[PDB]
């Protein structure tokens, strides 16, 4: 993440991929489901 609203709010869970945090587990687990679908990046080698 670059910069959001929350600043002094520690969450119980955290994403190791980017750093996204959520209140519940299942809430985060899904946030990782997108880290796979769009994982294979690379349109061209310039």
Residues that bind Zn ion (CB under 5 A): 15, 17-18, 20
Output phi, psi for 26, to 5 deg: -45, -30
Nearer to Zn ion, 38 or 46 (CB): 38
Residues in the chain after which the backbone breaks (C–N beyond 2.5 Å)? none
Shortest Å, Cβ 46 to Zn ion: 27
Shortest Å, Cβ 16 to Zn ion: 8
**What is the distance between the alpha carbons of residues 44 and 46, in angstroms, rounded to a whole number?**
6
Shortest Å, Cβ 35 to Zn ion: 6
């Amino acid at each position: 993440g670059s910069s959001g609203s929350s600043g002094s709010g520690e969450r119980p869970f955290k994403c190791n991929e980017c750093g996204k945090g959520f209140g519940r587990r299942s809430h985060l687990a899904g946030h990782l489901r997108l880290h796979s679908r769009e994982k294979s990046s690379g349109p061209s080698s310039g």
